[PDB]
Amino acid sequence: RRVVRATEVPVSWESFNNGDCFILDLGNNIHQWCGSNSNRYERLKATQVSKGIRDNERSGRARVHVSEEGTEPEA
Amino acid sequence: DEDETTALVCDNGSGLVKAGFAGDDAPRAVFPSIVGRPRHQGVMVGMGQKDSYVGDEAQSKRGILTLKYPIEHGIITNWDDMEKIWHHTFYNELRVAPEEHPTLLTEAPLNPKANREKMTQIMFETFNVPAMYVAIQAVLSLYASGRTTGIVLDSGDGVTHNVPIYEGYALPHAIMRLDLAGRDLTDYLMKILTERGYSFVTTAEREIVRDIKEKLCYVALDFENEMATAASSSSLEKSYELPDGQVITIGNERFRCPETLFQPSFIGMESAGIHETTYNSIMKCDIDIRKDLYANNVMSGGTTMYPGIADRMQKEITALAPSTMKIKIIAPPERKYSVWIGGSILASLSTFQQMWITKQEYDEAGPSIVHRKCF
Amino acid sequence: ETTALVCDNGSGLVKAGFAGDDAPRAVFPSIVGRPRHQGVMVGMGQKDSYVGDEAQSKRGILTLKYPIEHGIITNWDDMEKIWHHTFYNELRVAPEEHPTLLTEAPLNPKANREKMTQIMFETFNVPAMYVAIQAVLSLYASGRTTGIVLDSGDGVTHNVPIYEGYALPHAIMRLDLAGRDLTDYLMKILTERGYSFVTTAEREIVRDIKEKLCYVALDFENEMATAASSSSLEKSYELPDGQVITIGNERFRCPETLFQPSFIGMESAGIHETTYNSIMKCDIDIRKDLYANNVMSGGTTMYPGIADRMQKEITALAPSTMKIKIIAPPERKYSVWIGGSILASLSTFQQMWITKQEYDEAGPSIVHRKCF
Amino acid sequence: ETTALVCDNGSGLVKAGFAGDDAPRAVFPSIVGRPRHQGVMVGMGQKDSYVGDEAQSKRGILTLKYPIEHGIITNWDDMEKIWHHTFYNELRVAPEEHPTLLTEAPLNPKANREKMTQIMFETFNVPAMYVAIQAVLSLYASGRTTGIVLDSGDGVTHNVPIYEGYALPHAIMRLDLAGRDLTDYLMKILTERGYSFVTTAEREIVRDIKEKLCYVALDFENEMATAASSSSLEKSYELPDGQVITIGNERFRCPETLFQPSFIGMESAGIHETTYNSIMKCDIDIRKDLYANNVMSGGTTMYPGIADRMQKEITALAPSTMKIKIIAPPERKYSVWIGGSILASLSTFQQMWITKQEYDEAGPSIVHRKCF
Ligand SMILES: Nc1ncnc2c1ncn2[C@@H]1O[C@H](COP(=O)(O)OP(=O)(O)OP(=O)(O)O)[C@@H](O)[C@H]1O
Ligand SMILES: Nc1ncnc2c1ncn2[C@@H]1O[C@H](COP(=O)(O)OP(=O)(O)OP(=O)(O)O)[C@@H](O)[C@H]1O
Ligand SMILES: Nc1ncnc2c1ncn2[C@@H]1O[C@H](COP(=O)(O)OP(=O)(O)O)[C@@H](O)[C@H]1O
Ligand SMILES: [Ca+2]
Ligand SMILES: [Ca+2]
Ligand SMILES: [Ca+2]
Ligand SMILES: [Ca+2]
């Protein structure tokens, strides 16, 4: 809510909930999934962590995708 | 995290004023920006007959008042009435003294400079706030969505503008503005309601036509097939109840009114629709950043609250763009108040405290400090 | 115990990694970008200078400057930014532990060598350092000790004769056209089809068109005849806006600027006969091996048919009493790094390092006597 | 016995007249207007397409489209309407009797040349035809055979070096901003004074404001300082609805987009250094007169003070060991037509015509061998 943090969670559909936000890292493609009940600050933190993990760990050799419910890509 | 603040966010849009505190999830006072003055003879002495009514009480007594909007297509016209509006929203709605609270205000792009100097002059001299900032509405709407890359189509009651921002950097040469919004849709609906014999001339009748536009109108997916369906059958007709007890019915006028947004030639303007305005807003940007801007179309404002406008927008942009591109359109359900929500974010950020225009900067630099600090 | 670093500073493509590896760990273009619009999304990690492939990603909203032009270091602060991005962001290592091996252009001025020594030893505080030459390290990458090297990267083209594992400074020659000038030529000859590319942001798009779709014609005039008559060689490319362009005779006209410099107006010689001009400047008795080892290096040797056309053009104008072969390994675009990796990992390279304490009581002049 | 015709098809202003004259007979803007409302009063001369200055007269009730954009013909049927309106209504001549001379932009695609040949021979049935270049007729109007020509009209700006009476195609460059983009930038920078112009009907009013009240500042920052401090340069204009606008510092900020394209977000070079970029691309021997003959042409060279600012900007970044002079004749907005009228009226031009029977047994390909 105020102190927003990231935690590594194992890769499964059961780990997803609607109240938080999620960052799926698949190498050259990074997907940002936002919940419907997710708020403003963790959306901003998800965007900031996404641009950080693109431009620092991969040095811009990635493409960040933003999606929500119903608009999930094929990846 | 982000540090606390005692700032106020006051979206002073063309139809509504949305005022509240920074850090909160919703604006505390939402009320339409009108000033009502009586046009009838007051024969009953006493009982507090005011010379002017402001806010929601002006909506309550609108039959015996003439109503004026001091904001006309984003430009503030009558400064005394709009000063009365800020006095009402500081003292009567929020019930706070502005002397110990910074204030954040909103403005459309490509407004005249004299709006910014006069807004600076009445905020610093009259109310004596300790700080001020003014920001673009579409930047604040993109703050609300949480994204950084995207084109925002912000359409209030007076101004409909396209702003593309790639990463953190806006492109000022690609800013489009069109004076086609809910005022002109309300006036066009008032024109086409005479085809069924219903006459609406006064300002309270303009408020009633605004209510029927909010409550019944919708965007058709394809205009000619929906016109043939409405001509063939009578299933599309719907009813509405006047406050005096009369009942009216409307058919094709449900979808002919928002079609002015996609075809402005109904009201005599040769400028093209909002879809082509979005398309050449994308085309005026340079070639490397079209891919991300197609997939992050964001709408905001009450004028984007029609049902079915996202599907028509998707079909028109999918027709205009080349077929290999994926086009995604973001329409959150809280997009009416997204300007204020992003304002609460931007007032609540820790970085922002070294961009407040303080009192001493205004005293040393005149009202022209705001163009060197803001935008 | 510690591992050395190899860093090949190319004119438009810099390679880096650890010693003892069969491929460079990071390949990224040496581009320093600066923003050209104002950042209204404040507090969200906006930077005054984007460097490396990060600048390549958001290349539309930046102006891009090359710190090395024509193989020679010119802008030094941006070059230090390339080094800071290379050590700290790319390789993710501290420079204080690892010795660093660099590569220099042939016939570099000595002041550039002294300043490379000074910003390596002072700014990053390396424990050991060494400088070496592109072309002889490409020859060690070819497994040979005697031969000509045509090193044609992004800035210049160098022709280096080497005998007994050492270059011959009278006979290295320079020809100033490479893939940057080919990109500008392709930028010129797409205007007749109606496609416009005028700024530095879409120059890498034209470079990608050059990399994906180009080939060297073995004979040029009949290829004009077949391209004018038929349309079998016309192929399409997908721009990242989604517009599809189509390329006909301009696919192979762009390699031919190397053989005909008068396509872009300068009076100098083509790439085939300048090797003849270099090899006539050498001594007679060496030439029997010196023609036989035709080492090709650089990323502008990736074109298909460059070897057969090179063999034909050398065989036309050399005397007919001698056999000519052209060699072109598949890893010759990384061969300078492969040479740096094998030289940094040797059992005899520990005494050839320039240590910190040797730099302290000699200053920036010990690099001349040891890198020699 | 018959008289030839000169027809310079500008991107926003088309000129036409008879050969051998000191001025073009008809100058009118190249627009095609179409009605946007329903004509309820029938039988009173309503047309489905107004063309020429007639569309400029009743421009309030029309939508306007430019058939030529960026110097290149795009919409062809509207261009046929333009040619019909030149031949029949303006000049009041039958096209079957008079030969016609045409002008094109440099680096014109070949298909446009063939299509101009095809519609000029088939539709109107001319007896003779010839196609020339803008810049060579601009140089012939100046009485020179070697020089740089800056043709900056309404669509595009061209820098063309010409040596020995012929252009150098490797050094011609096209910078794509002109008076249309200046009109759009002035349309942008009149909003802050509260004046709103949006549609194409009032774009011509902004063009008239740009023509009547603009000037190039010799130095920009002190001009901005004196505009901010005093009010001696603020002047008024009378709009045709009776309202009076006033303009201050925007009088000189809008010519400065030619020197600074970053005002409209274009990353490309300013107008002074692209001529330098053209002149280094020429050969080293022929620069000495080429710097001396600085020929300015086009309607957007008619600002007061553009020549002195141009002299200052060239003299700043050129080497100081040579003299820069710029010529600017007062008739330079019609100089293409003057060069065409001199060229058509000669005693050696009757053999250079492309006659009808030469078009018959060659098709639309004889223009590739005769207008060169
Ligand atoms: N497949 C390809 N086809 C065409 N050109 C290519 C290809 N691959 C790379 N290039 C070009 O090769 C150049 C990069 O090669 P290389 O890495 O050897 O150069 P460099 O080390 O930066 O240059 P220099 O030796 O001048 O310092 C660029 O101009 C690039 O466009
Ligand atoms: N006095 C003036 N000051 C500034 N601009 C002017 C003036 N007179 C004309 N122009 C502008 O010059 C342009 C037209 O000039 P000109 O006739 O040379 O161009 P053109 O032949 O139509 O263009 P192009 O060569 O690109 O085809 C228009 O933009 C017009 O507004
Ligand atoms: N549900 C709705 N359907 C259609 N239009 C709406 C709806 N709600 C609000 N509007 C329109 O939005 C306009 C005001 O929107 P908003 O942007 O919130 O206020 P402002 O324009 O003052 O900033 C009104 O003119 C109204 O016509
Ligand atoms: Ca949560
Ligand atoms: Ca609004
Ligand atoms: Ca190299
Ligand atoms: Ca012209």
Q: Read out DSSP for D83-120?
A: HHIIIIIIS---TTTS-EEEEE-TT--HHHHHHHHHHH
> Is A19 annotated as belonging to a binding site?
yes
Cβ B345–A51 below 8 Å, yes or no?
no
Across-strand partners of C11?
A: none
Question: What part of B 149-178 touches C (C-beta under 8 Å)?
Answer: 165-172
Give bridge partners of residue C17 from the DSSP assignment: C6
* Pocket perturbation via mutation, ligand 3, pick of B157, B240, B304 by most ligand atoms within 8 A of CB: B157
Q: Strand pairing partners for C225?
A: none
D74: left (phi over 0), alpha (psi -120 to 50) or beta: alpha
CB-CB neighbors (< 8 A) of A47 in chain B: 146-148
Same domain membership, residue D238 and residue D189: yes
Task: Name the residue facing B265 among D36, D200, D264 (closest C-beta).
Answer: D36
Nearest ligand by distance to the CA of C134: 6
Nearest CA to ligand 1 atom 19: C153
> Do residues D350 and D254 both lie within one domain?
no
**DSSP state, residue B24:** -
Beta-ladder partners of D247: D235
Burial of C224 (0-12, 13-18, 19+ CB in 10 A): middle
Cα radius of gyration (chain A): 12
Q: How far is CA B361 from CA B350, B367, B373, D168, in A?
A: 21, 9, 10, 58
Where in the sequence is the domain holding D86, given as residue range(s)? 1-31+68-131+334-368
What's the CA gap between A68 and C181, in Å, rounded?
A: 46
How far is C-alpha C323 from the chain's CA centre? 29
A2 annotated as ligand-binding: yes
- Paired tokens of D154: 């309404």
Answer yes or no: are the C-beta atoms of C314 and C287 closer than 8 Å. Answer: no
Q: Which residue, chain included where needed, has tokens 């005998």?
A: C163
Q: How far is B245 from chain D (nearest CA, A)?
A: 39
The residues, ordered by sequence, that sit 6+ positions from B172 with a Cβ below 8 Å of its Cβ are C37, C38, D265
Nearest to B138 by CA among B103, B182, B108, B176: B108
- Is D99 found in the same domain as D200? no
Q: Tell me, what DSSP letter sits at residue C90?
A: I
* Integer Cα distance of B69 and B203 in angstroms: 10
Q: Which two tokens stand for residue B337?
A: 């108040």
| CB count in 10 Å sphere of residue D127 | 17
CATH assignment of the domain containing B128: 3.30.420.40
Closest residue of chain D to C197, computed from CA coordinates: D268
Q: Which two tokens stand for residue D170?
A: 């490797």
Q: Among C150, C154, C156, C159, which residue has the most ligand 1 atoms within 8 Å of its CB, making it the best to mutate? A: C154
Which residue of chain B comes nearest to D190, CA vs CA? B112
Would you say A54 is a known binding-site residue? Answer: no
Both tokens assigned to D218? 């010799």
Q: Which ligand is nearest to the CA of C15?
A: 1
- Displacement of CA B210 from its chain's centroid (Å): 14
User: Is A1 labelled a binding residue?
Assistant: yes
Task: Give yes or no: residues D107 and D220 share one domain.
Answer: no
B363 and B351 in a common domain: yes
Residues D26 and D94 placed together within one structural domain of the fold: yes
Contact, D108 vs D127, CB < 8 A? no
Please state, in angstroms and rounded to a whole number, the distance separating the CA atoms of residues A63 and B178: 33
Task: Give the Cα separation of B344 and B143 in Å (integer).
Answer: 10
Nearest ligand, CA of residue C14? 1
Query: Which three-class secondary structure state does DSSP give residue D292?
Result: helix
Residue C366 has a CB neighbour count (10 Å cut-off) of 17
Final residue of a domain: which of C226, C242, C264? Answer: C264
Cα→Cα distances C125→C19, C94, C99, C341, C366, Å: 19, 10, 10, 21, 16
Examine the domain organization and report whether B220 and B78 are in the same domain.
no
Report strand pairing: B103-107 vs D166-167: unpaired
**C-beta separation of C40 from B139 below 8 A:** yes
Task: Please state whether beta strands C14-18 and C26-28 pair in parallel, antiparallel, or not at all (unpaired).
Answer: antiparallel
C5 and C78 belong to one structural domain = yes
How far apart, in whole angstroms, are the C-alpha atoms of residue C185 and residue A13? Answer: 52
CB under 8 Å to C56, separation ≥6 — which residues? A60, C28, C29, C31, C204
Distance CA B209, CA B257 (A): 11
Query: Whose alpha carbon is nearest atom 9 of ligand 1?
Result: C299
Report yes or no: C7 and C86 within 8 Å, Cβ to Cβ. Answer: yes
CA angle D128, D129, D134 (to 5 degrees): 155
H-state helical runs in chain D: 53-57, 76-84, 110-122, 134-141, 179-188, 203-212, 220-229, 250-253, 271-281, 287-292, 306-317, 335-344, 356-360, 367-370
Cα distances (Å, whole numbers) of residue A63 to A50, B145, C35, C53, C266: 10, 19, 20, 12, 42
Place of tokens 């499964």: A12
3-class SS of residue D73: strand
Distances in Å between the alpha carbon of B188 and those of B73, B180, B250, B254? 16, 11, 14, 12
Looking at residue D26, its amino acid is: A
C47 part of contact set with chain D, CB < 8 Å: no
Q: Which residue from D minimizes the CA distance to B272?
A: D199
CA of B122 to the centre of ligand 3 (A): 27
Q: How far apart are CA C196 and CA C180, in angstroms?
A: 17
Nearest to D63 among B110, B111, B270 (CB): B270
Cα–Cα distance for residue pair D119/D77, rounded to 1 Å: 10
Q: Which amino acid is at B292?
A: D
Alpha-carbon span C71 to C52, nearest angstrom? 18
CA–CA distance, D168 with D179 (Å, rounded to integer): 26
The answer on B158 and B260 residing in a single domain is no
Read off the CATH number of the domain in which B188 is found.
Answer: 3.90.640.10
Closest CA to A2 of B221, C265, B350, B301: B350
Q: Is D286 on the interface with B (CB under 8 A)?
A: no
Probe ligand 2: pick from D154, D295, D303, max atoms within 8 Å of CB?
D154
Q: At D39, which CATH number? A: 2.30.36.70
Q: Is D323 on the interface with B (CB under 8 A)?
A: no
**Distance between CA atoms of C63 and C202, rounded to whole angstroms?**
11
Distance CA D359, CA B77 (A): 67
Q: What is the CA radius of gyration of chain B?
A: 22
Which H or E element spans position C105? none
B58 and B76 in a single domain? The answer is no
Number of domains in chain B: 4
Using the 3D structure, point to which of C264, C296, C319 is the last residue of a domain: C264
> At residue D223, what is the residue type?
E
Whether D151 lines ligand 2, by a CB cut-off of 6 Å, is yes
Question: Which uninterrupted H or E stretch holds D233?
Answer: none
- For D26, how many CA atoms within 13 A lie in the half-sphere containing its CB? 24
Calpha distance D281→D279 (Å, rounded): 5
Please tell me the experimental approach by which this structure was elucidated. cryo-EM
Query: Are A60 and C44 inside 8 Å of each other by CB?
Result: no
CB burial of D141-171 (b: ≥16 within 10 Å; e: otherwise) equals bbebebbbbbbbbbbbbbbbbbbeeebbebb
In angstroms, the CA C315 to CA C169 distance is 26
Say how far apart CA C350 and CA B140 lie, in whole Å. 60
Residues C185, C263 contacting (CB under 8 angstroms): yes
**Which residue blocks in C105-153 are alpha helix, DSSP H?**
110-122, 134-141
Q: Which residue in D111, D132, D122 sits closest to D360, CA to CA?
A: D122
| Residue of the CA atom closest to atom 21 of ligand 1 | C10
User: What are D76's two structure tokens?
Assistant: 């062809």
Token reading at C304: 């298909």
- What stretch of H or E contains D265? none
Nearest CA in chain D to C35: D267
Instruction: Name the closest residue on chain A to residue C85, using Cα atoms.
Output: A59
User: Please, what's the largest Cα pairwise distance for chain C?
Assistant: 72
Asked if B341 lies within 8 A of A40 by C-beta distance, the reply is yes
Q: Which of B152, B120, B155 is nearest to B139 (CA)?
A: B152
For residues C39 and C43, give the distance between their C-alpha atoms in angstroms, rounded to a whole number: 10
Give yes or no for a contact between B111 and B74, defined as CB atoms under 8 angstroms apart.
yes
Q: What is the Cα Rg of chain D in Å? A: 22
User: Strand ranges (DSSP E) for C30-167?
Assistant: 32-35, 50-51, 62-65, 68-69, 72-73, 100-104, 128-133, 147-152, 157-163, 166-167
Neighbours of chain D (3+ CB pairs under 8 A): B, C
Same domain as C141, residue C253: no
Q: Is D367 in the pocket of ligand 2 (CB under 6 A)?
A: no
Residues in chain D: 372
Please work out whether the CB of residue D10 comes within 6 Å of at least one atom of ligand 2: yes
The three state secondary structure string of B81-139 is HHHHHHHHHHHHHCCCCHHHCCEEEEECCCCCHHHHHHHHHHHHHCCCCCEEEEEEHHH
Smallest CA-to-CA distance from B343 within B142, B113, B65, B124 is with B142
Chain B interface disruption, residue of A66, A68, A72, most B CBs within 10 A:
A66
Lookup: tokens for D240? 């045709």
Radius of gyration of chain C (CA): 22
Nearest ligand to residue A2 Cα: 4
b/e burial code for range B22-31 (CB count within 10 A of at least 16 → b): bbeeebebbb
Quick one: tokens of D257?
């987009």
Are D9 and D39 in a shared domain? no
Residue C2's contacts (CB-CB under 8 Å, 6 or more residues apart) are C97, C98, C99
C-alpha span between C175 and B321 (Å, rounded): 45
Closest CA to C172 of C116, C248, C105, C221: C105
